[PDB]
Symmetry: D3
Subunit: 150 residues, 6 copies
């Protein structure tokens, strides 16, 4: 690609002091952080982020909650990072999440499940460009590259 995924710590993950933990789970798997910021996300941005859900009953409540406190959008790079990101986050519903996953370790409620992650490569490219301008995406050559992929 290089393959990239969009990860976002939600307002409850910020409140509960889990930003570094989410980042560390990607770093220890050898994934490269290429962008990050903390922001108050606007209603208009969140409506576009969740546009696939705009027809559903819970969409207005989700958009208001996601603007009720700061969030931390970020972008990770590496092999199979989209599908591995989804596994590392765990099932949407925490009670279906296996331990070792972020939601299985930290969450008890689907509406407070700490972190968002792209569900497909097409979604990831859309979300990365929605939240970050190209100038915010940093590029570097990871020294351990020969030892993390063949």
């Amino acid at each position: 690609g290089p393959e990239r995924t969009f990860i976002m710590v939600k307002p409850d993950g910020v409140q509960r002091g889990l930003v570094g933990e989410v980042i560390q789970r990607f770093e220890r798997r050898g994934y490269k952080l290429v962008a990050i910021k903390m922001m108050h996300a606007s209603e208009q941005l969140l409506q576009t982020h969740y546009e696939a859900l705009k027809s559903l009953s819970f969409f207005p409540k989700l958009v208001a909650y996601m603007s009720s406190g700061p969030v931390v959008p970020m972008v990770f790079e590496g092999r199979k990072v989209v599908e591995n990101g989804r596994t590392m986050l765990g099932a949407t519903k925490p009670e279906a999440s296996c331990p070792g996953s972020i939601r299985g370790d930290y969450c008890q409620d689907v509406g407070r499940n700490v972190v968002h992650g792209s569900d497909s490569t097409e979604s990831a490219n859309r979300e990365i460009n929605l939240w970050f301008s190209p100038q915010e995406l940093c590029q570097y050559k990871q020294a351990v590259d020969p030892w993390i992929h063949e």
Copy 2:
């Protein structure tokens, strides 16, 4: 409920220095500790605790083992805490337990599997009241409550 489950560190979990680890796995998922104590559990208490097993060949051996060293009964409170407790503990048999679970991380033998957890809400209410008097159950309002459930 508020929903509550009964968790008990078994004599081997005490010996192996895993009491804090069991507690921390519930705390980091946002669950509230509401009771805890260390005790030598009597044969009569353990026979009542395991009354569903009283007809089985291994019951006398289980009751003697569970009174052979101190145990740490405790009670946790939060959404889906009974079913999530069972997932966090792992399969009864450690070799069937996924890593990330307590028994998958620490155990190799079903008869030394570190920790007990209620299997149903009806069992949890029975076990909580069997091991703790109402005066031992503490109540407080968790400050992070708005960020752990909706």
Copy 3:
């Protein structure tokens, strides 16, 4: 002695989900847990606990704060456990605490410093007996004993 010290997680340590962490720091140093409970501590108990401070301006405020939410008293056993307990907790003032200590890792304010620990063997014996009846103190022989002391 066997030497024993009294450790108590304060209301802020309970709220912030640090009970298991405090316990684990003693367990991994080979210390034996011999008693623990969660309780709402009464004004009368806390006045006796802090009787050395009864003449000081901040005593009424300290006693009210220490009864404002549940606490977790506990007792640990092993060689040099009183003096090592004080080192493991860190300076009273978090800003004077070295990292690696509980208060240096988790605290920013002397009035919210998570955990209490006996300052002398005479204080420890007094505090243990103040908070626990003899029947609550459990005794067992630690299997790793030959490898934790000579």
Copy 4:
């Protein structure tokens, strides 16, 4: 203030996958993240950041190194965060750093010491405003606030 300090993961901390670890050390002490970003820092920015060092022999080499790969500037908020930040980072020279500090845990060379932190409140205010526009500084009320300071 509210008191704030500027923390920056240096290019070697990014390469070595330590961004989340630095963040987590501040979060677990109850400090609030209020800004963060990943960027390629320019020579002009770094010369201003290090203006106190502009007369010294190693300044050109330091500025070139600090622009040789991406960095992660960030801002933390809470009581005594400037002086506690310096303690948490450890001595400038890793060999003088106590274990438990970031540089004592991860570093072996003063020129690759992973992370920068403000040395005074006057430096912190200058550095925060140098690296972040006011619109990038987020504000929220931490739910655990009553339990982290008095």
Copy 5:
């Protein structure tokens, strides 16, 4: 048996500083380390180690990679250690590995999957004797033995 399995940190696990982590995952499950060494493995040794794969297209490339940097062979002892070793390592393919497993936590590429583990008791006995002479296998009685198995 006593049952034993062969575990080997591959060249990428050495480079990425994961030797202690692999060892610790077995130790915390109560397994006994009975042999370990760091070596440059020769082509002839690796061809014998992987003799089941000698007919396959990727065998020469695998043998050259496995001799391209030092490896850490080791031997662990305890109940069900072969089958539990395979679960703890995770699926061969990291993207099929559950979090909590070594490859699910640290790996993104099947050709850089950090660690080898015996797939059967017959393979384990063969591999142990291939990499270690009998004099390198140490024997001791684990003090916690009564608390890790019945």
Copy 6:
């Protein structure tokens, strides 16, 4: 040098499952493992290892204890690794050790203090060559080298 130090997990560190933990503390500081093995150390080897102590009353008891169960000698390489090794291990006496050090985190008795480390570069060269033949010392180029030292 390249500078190297000799580290040895003592019989109590093996029993207590701390081998991986000792290794991980050096790895996360960027130090290179260059040799390791598990062995039953003979009286003659240990008398030579501790020859500086041969005149002292406790020497025979120390030599018998150090041969009473397997040990794990090892060798680490990197900048200032001898002096940093001593800091990471902590004071000889655990009660004088700061938290964050190995002995401050895990030990309560000077005669069961888990791990040995060279006290000087002259001692390190002697001890490395006493415990390892030159063929056991592995050499490789660490990919992160440009980011761990200047």
